[PDB]
Design a binder for this molecule. Structure first.
Ligand SMILES: *[C@@H]1O[C@H](CO)[C@@H](O)[C@H](O)[C@H]1NC(C)=O
Ligand SMILES: *[C@@H]1O[C@H](CO)[C@@H](O)[C@H](O)[C@H]1NC(C)=O
Length: 383
């Protein structure tokens, strides 16, 4: 009764060579819930925005995805609205008034019906965030949107789920999330327990540390997976609504010129914007898991791999390049910790970045770990 929640990126199909990942590559049987990412909202009319219509509609992306239920009827297939690239201002604008919320809600209902989705995942990043076009009133009005969506889903009578991807930093919770009221309306809270460190922070560090490290101070003191999930509990979310995100990617850095200190917390060349882009994801500061293992794990690799003894995450470096990530050892540790805490399950961003080709060894090695641990686990009653 635990969840294994798999986000699927619709843009992964454009990655070159062995990076190409489409609907047919999803290992459906390893997941209990799979989420097509992303749709957005229109700026002007507050309706569902289809972001890649040639792929999503003309080549039948949405329906290929949802029709996977024919062979796997026990799996739920939903869609996510929002995500980083969509920005936050259109969402803050959409929730500002009852009328614009109801237009969005109606559009959502039409969309889910048309493409046979099982529900909606809310991925607005983030209500109340000033750097993302948000403002103070988002907190109340995001809750209203959620209540109104739930009521609309009830009226449709198809048992649709409504979930949300959420941050774990306290200031973001204070700015955007009425925790007890949201957790009551949502079927699951997908906690983004990753991107907790990165180039924007100005130092090198792993991005999903499980526990506090000695160098964690001020806004970072509690910014780790364990304390962050504890924060969601403390703010009123039941343990059996919390799903813990696991990143299948690493955050990378370019170290400062002449820096020979590779320890956690070491200074970086912030203006570089992150580590050099990798060949398949082509994004500064970001490496898919398979881009990491093909570089770090080869027999003749010149990369040095280390282990964060407190955060329980690997990191690796070579030259000016430094990457923190999750590997089978760190994922296993997190799976055991999820069961120890009694949380609802595990989530991954994102299934298209697992070693799905088996370039490094076992195909789909990371999602197999989530599936192995969660499928044998019984979620206990709320604590
Ligand atoms: C959907 O499936 C059809 C038939 O297999 C295929 O031709 C098409 O490329 C698929 N669309 C996408 C977006 O994967
Ligand atoms: C890689 O990303 C950059 C933007 O950073 C883009 O301009 C460039 O065309 C991309 N290269 C490939 C091979 O897609």
């Amino acid at each position: 009764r635990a969840r294994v929640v798999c986000y699927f990126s619709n843009w992964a199909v454009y990655r070159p060579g062995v990076g190409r990942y489409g609907i047919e590559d999803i290992p459906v049987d390893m997941c209990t819930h799979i989420i097509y990412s992303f749709i957005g909202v229109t700026e002007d009319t507050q309706q569902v925005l289809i972001i890649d219509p040639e792929l999503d509609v003309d080549k039948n992306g949405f329906k290929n995805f949802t029709s996977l239920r024919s062979k796997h009827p026990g799996v739920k297939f939903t869609v996510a609205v929002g995500g980083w690239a969509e920005g936050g201002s259109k969402y803050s604008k959409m929730v500002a008034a009852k009328s614009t919320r109801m237009a969005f809600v109606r559009s959502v209902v039409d969309f889910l019906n048309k493409y046979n989705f099982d529900g909606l995942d809310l991925d607005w990043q983030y209500p109340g965030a000033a750097d993302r076009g948000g403002s103070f009133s988002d907190k109340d009005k995001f809750l209203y949107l959620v209540q109104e969506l739930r009521r609309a889903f009830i009226r449709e009578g198809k048992g649709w789920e409504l979930t949300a991807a959420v941050p774990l930093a306290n200031f973001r919770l204070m700015e955007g999330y009425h925790v007890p009221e949201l957790c009551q309306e949502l079927d699951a809270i997908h906690v983004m327990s990753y991107d907790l460190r990165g180039n924007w922070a100005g130092f090198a560090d792993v991005h999903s540390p499980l526990y506090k490290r000695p160098h964690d101070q001020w806004a970072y003191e509690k910014l780790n997976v364990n304390d962050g999930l504890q924060l969601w509990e403390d703010k009123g979310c039941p343990t059996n609504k919390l799903v813990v995100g696991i990143p299948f990617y690493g955050r990378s850095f370019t170290l400062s010129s002449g820096n020979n200190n590779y320890n956690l917390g070491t200074y970086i060349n912030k203006e570089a914007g992150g580590g050099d882009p990798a060949p398949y994801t082509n994004a500064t500061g970001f490496w898919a898991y398979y881009e990491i293992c093909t570089e770090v794990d080869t027999a003749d690799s010149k990369w040095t791999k280390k282990w964060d003894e407190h955060g329980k995450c690997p990191y690796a470096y070579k030259g000016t390049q430094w990457v923190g990530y999750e590997d089978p050892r760190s994922v296993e540790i997190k799976m055991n910790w999820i069961k120890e805490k009694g949380y609802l399950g595990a989530m991954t961003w994102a299934i298209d970045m697992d070693d799905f080709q088996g370039l490094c060894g076992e195909k789909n090695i990371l999602i197999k770990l989530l599936h192995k641990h969660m499928s044998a686990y019984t979620v206990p009653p709320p604590r």
